[model samples]
Target: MNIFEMLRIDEGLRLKIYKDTEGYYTIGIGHLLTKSPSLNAAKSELDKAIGRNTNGVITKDEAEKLFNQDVDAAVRGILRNAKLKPVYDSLDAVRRAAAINMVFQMGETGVAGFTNSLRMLQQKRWDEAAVNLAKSRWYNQTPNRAKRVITTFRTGTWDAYK
Candidate 1:
């Protein structure tokens, strides 16, 4: 399945405004609350959401269109920043996703700097991959979030992800 379809399953569709698990006012797939709207902005998404402009509501199709646009950029980024195109296809889906996040953050060159980590990943040494990730500057910067990626590398499970 495509990213939009998969994310839709995770997020669920909502045509009406409601509270998310984090209690943020959300609508239209997973769009978070908008701080404000002019309600008169020209050529607006407001038209798609509601005729009322600032009413903060959107149809299912409208939400899907927005998500598709976002996913399009993500796909472009993955293609642009991940130099290992064959490796990306060869990896399992969860690992593919994990790698995508890393590439997005640091781009292909930055990811290539993780010499041991890339070596481990290429060698299919999953545990060592986790260890190599934990040993990086990215890991040290904010281990709490980075650990999720580390755990995924270790266990090969999507469970650790937010």
Candidate 2:
């Protein structure tokens, strides 16, 4: 299955603004705009993409388009990390998806802080990496998502490819 399809389940679609679990202003499949300074700029961008503006609603196609752009940003974020790029590339397909999933939730810089876990993954120490992931504050914050990602790390399988 495509990783985008998998993430759709984890990051639900919403036409209107909603606060994420961390209380940030997010919209349209985890597109965070909390740090954007103003919604005028944001709404203008979305308006251009969708070719029209509603009060606060967007079309499903527009939401998916925004989601794709967010995924691109996440991928770029991961690739730009010197410490994470090689480790991410060295992973299997499923594990690579897990890594991207992580960056999609936490920023790449946040995931880059997992020094030991990244090294363990680089060394293909699956269980150790899973253990490291489980011990993080992120694990406690979103246990379900964390468990699926950690399980992917541990088993090197698509079991978590929801």
Candidate 3:
């Protein structure tokens, strides 16, 4: 299945999983953190929950460590992917950083699979890129979040396509 479809399925599953766990108030299916008054304390709680949900495969104390390592690996993987390398190599610093964030949140496989979208980006079609990036919002399952993210991309806050 495509990333959008997969995200839809995963997002549903995430909600079900959160309901089953019932340990922490879920921010969302995949999001462990909460927007609480005590941000640091909330983060600590989130770290613990993440460790618990991940079955000690990742630990609260090790969350930051794991994130640092994983992000590096993910960035390297994106840089090395033949299909994505050209796009990455061609991007300006700001766009490159944004793309990296998107790829990190998504995955290299997903990023690489956006064949037509990447082509539009390669051709410097900003509008087409915006459209393509907006297309990705269907995966989020909420119109508000999807619209907001798309708006951000469209406004060049984080050049989604290019």
The most accurate candidate by lDDT is 2
> lDDT for each of the candidates?
0.61, 0.83, 0.52
Angstrom error of the Cα, residue 160, model 3: value is 11
Residue-level lDDT of model 1, residues 68-157, one tens digit each, is 655554556656645556555667777776665565344467675777776688678998788778888788865765786667666767
In model 3, how large is the Cα lDDT of residue 123? Answer: 73
For candidate 2, list the clashing residue pairs, or say none.
none
lDDT of 2 by residue, 65-98 (tens): 8889878888898899998899989988888888
Model 2's C-alpha root-mean-square deviation from the true structure amounts to: 2.3
Model 3, 45-127: lDDT tens per residue?
65575554442134333444444544566669878999988887775554555455556455688778878777776676767
Residue runs of model 1 more than 4 Å from their true location after superposition: 1-71, 80-82
Tell me the alpha-carbon RMSD of every candidate: 6.6, 2.3, 10.7
How displaced is residue 156 in candidate 1, in Å?
1.7
Runs off by more than 4 Å, candidate 2: 35-52
Residue-pair clashes per candidate: 0, 0, 0
Winner by TM-score between candidate 3 and candidate 2: 2
- The model with the greater lDDT, 2 or 3, is 2
TM-score of each: 0.53, 0.88, 0.53
Off by over 4 Å in 3: 1-61, 137-162
